[PDB]
Amino acid sequence: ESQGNESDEGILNNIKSLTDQVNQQIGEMTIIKGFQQEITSEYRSLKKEEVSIELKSEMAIKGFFSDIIPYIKKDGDSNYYPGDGRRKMLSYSIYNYLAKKKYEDKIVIYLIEEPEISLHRSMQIALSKQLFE
């Protein structure tokens, strides 16, 4: 939905080149080349089909967009983490973010059923403020 300028297009093409090089570098390893060469022979012995078996990274084939996910990064810390309550809270902000700018052409009705399940009481008050204030 967002607009893509020329600079973003250049970055998009640059990433595709980087992922392609990643797949090319994987095929250059000895242990990778050794396995896929012999597993090809095993397959050929199984069935006289003219095919070859290659080991490629799935993301480098589908593209970076395929497996991009949000990471809750605490400030001052270089580690990236997939806590649990913060995941529930941030999952609501995605709903908050979408509510602002996703469905501008339809009436959106939210059916929120038992939000308090496995939710800390401080987070319940936070959700209460979102719903009514």
Binding site: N13, N14, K16, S17, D20, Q21, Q24
Partner: protein, 114 residues
Amino acid sequence: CYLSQEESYKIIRNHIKANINPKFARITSDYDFCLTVVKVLELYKPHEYIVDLNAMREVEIYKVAPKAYQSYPIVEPFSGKDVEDLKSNIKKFLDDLMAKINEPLVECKCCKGR
């Protein structure tokens, strides 16, 4: 007698990387499937960032690829009636290509490179 499509690309890359002048041009994308060398739209060469600490539009020139890849221009296979004729042709094309890439930047006149 003509060289292969991939072999034609291989020699240009290896020779461009050889005589490339960082003063005028820079190589950005250097991959087995694509190549992109751009100019350095920037002032005199020695010790600029150093005087910066003391104080306190990018343009592509050549884009080639052995095979159809993204929007990269396709490479052309060096074809010559005689092998020495091919050798003369391959050299002349390269100097013509690479004198272009090392050509000093225009002074920019009105806007003074700003």
